[PDB]
Design an enzyme around this catalytic site. Structure first.
Site, PDB file in Angstrom:
ATOM      1  N   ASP A  13     -34.690  -2.050  -4.948  1.00 25.03           N
ATOM      2  CA  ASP A  13     -35.620  -3.085  -4.555  1.00 25.03           C
ATOM      3  C   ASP A  13     -37.035  -2.495  -4.135  1.00 25.03           C
ATOM      4  O   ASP A  13     -36.987  -1.969  -2.842  1.00 25.03           O
ATOM      5  CB  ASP A  13     -35.034  -4.312  -3.421  1.00 25.03           C
ATOM      6  CG  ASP A  13     -35.858  -5.256  -3.105  1.00 25.03           C
ATOM      7  OD1 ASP A  13     -36.930  -5.423  -3.645  1.00 25.03           O
ATOM      8  OD2 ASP A  13     -35.604  -5.780  -2.081  1.00 25.03           O
ATOM      9  N   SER A  43     -54.153  -6.722 -10.862  1.00 26.75           N
ATOM     10  CA  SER A  43     -54.276  -6.443 -12.080  1.00 26.75           C
ATOM     11  C   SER A  43     -55.792  -7.398 -12.765  1.00 26.75           C
ATOM     12  O   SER A  43     -56.612  -7.899 -11.751  1.00 26.75           O
ATOM     13  CB  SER A  43     -53.360  -7.646 -12.583  1.00 26.75           C
ATOM     14  OG  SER A  43     -53.475  -8.062 -13.829  1.00 26.75           O
TER      15      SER A  43
END
Length: 330
Positions: free
Chosen positions: A35, A199
């Site tokens: 994770d 992004s």
């Protein structure tokens, strides 16, 4: 030194990936969920409430010659989905794909929430975010990656998740045969303790790329792609009959519809997620209504590039003093 381990999806929908990890001497093999959205290495153990264990392999510190109780240290964690766990802390030898770390904090769970008990395939979590998020008190502990960093050939780990197939987690090296073209690197902010990046935009199917900044985190421990309401509504408007359902908890679509692909921007490069990766099957057995893999981040407060996005690329987590994320097509 390097490490290399295979990661396998737990089910036919790629809900989570499990990777074998050796703990203690002699080795006790447990299947942990790697994770990058948390920083605690916690396992089901002989100290977990017997009623809260449903088929998991448990770590037994009393059978390990290198295990030691970390006197007075406790931990308590609660995840974004509501799930939680807590208990005491041991130190022991932990190996991942031949890469060994001695004196790793191994958090033994005494109490686990219903979500963990139900998932018999997952023995625990191996946190890979920054050590500032570790929940051990009064003395904070380091992640496996932070402990292995000095010993690694390169201070990196790579995530190469498969679509309905096994993948790889590599430590200390970049396999130049696992990707195509070049790797585009982008800056990471460590301010909140996550692998946080920006992004450069998106496109839906064969549509025009929209240049806009989407701040989000690279999270292997989250199944889906969670993006702003505006982007997610632009995606589902292109699917016949798709709607956001409050009773289900997100966007659902007719199982007979075809899903367009989703493109996200990494600097000047583009990562294309095929429409097939966004299909999460029927909301219930026999239903003709299917669950979508792209959901709104509005109720969460953070955009998440989960397994749906991550499995479409070869991902480099560069933990050097100036951390970066690298993305490549595969």
């Amino acid at each position: 030194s390097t490490g290399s381990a295979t990661t396998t999806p737990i089910d036919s929908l790629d809900d989570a990936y499990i990777t074998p990890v050796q703990i203690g001497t002699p080795a006790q093999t447990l299947n942990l969920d790697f994770d990058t959205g948390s920083s605690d290495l916690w396992v089901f153990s002989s100290e977990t409430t017997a009623s809260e264990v449903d088929g998991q392999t448990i770590y037994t510190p009393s059978k390990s010659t290198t295990a030691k109780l970390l006197s007075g240290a406790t931990w308590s964690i609660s995840y974004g989905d509501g799930s939680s766990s807590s208990g005491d802390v041991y130190t022991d030898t932990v190996s991942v794909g031949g890469l060994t770390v001695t004196g790793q904090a191994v958090e033994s769970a005494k109490k686990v929430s219903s979500s963990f008990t139900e998932d018999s395939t997952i023995d625990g979590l191996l946190g890979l975010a920054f050590s500032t998020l570790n929940t051990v008190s009064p003395t904070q502990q380091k992640t496996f990656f932070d402990n292995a960093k000095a010993s690694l050939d390169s201070p990196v780990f790579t995530a190469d998740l498969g679509y309905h197939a096994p993948g790889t987690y590599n430590f200390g090296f970049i396999d130049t045969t696992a990707y195509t073209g070049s790797i585009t690197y982008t800056a990471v902010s460590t301010k909140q303790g996550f692998w946080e990046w920006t992004s450069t935009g998106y496109a839906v199917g064969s549509g025009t790329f929209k240049s806009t900044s989407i701040d989000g985190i690279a999270d292997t421990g989250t199944t889906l792609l969670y993006l702003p309401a505006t982007v997610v509504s632009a995606y589902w408007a292109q699917v016949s009959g798709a709607k956001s359902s409050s009773s289900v908890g997100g966007y659902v679509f007719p199982c007979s519809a075809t899903l367009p692909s989703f493109t996200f921007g990494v600097g000047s490069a583009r990562i294309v997620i095929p429409g097939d990766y966004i299909d999460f099957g029927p909301i219930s057995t026999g239903s003709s209504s299917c669950f979508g893999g792209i959901q709104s981040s509005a109720g969460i407060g953070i955009n998440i590039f989960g397994d749906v996005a991550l499995k479409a690329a070869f991902v480099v987590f560069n933990g050097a003093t100036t951390p970066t994320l690298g993305f490549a097509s595969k």
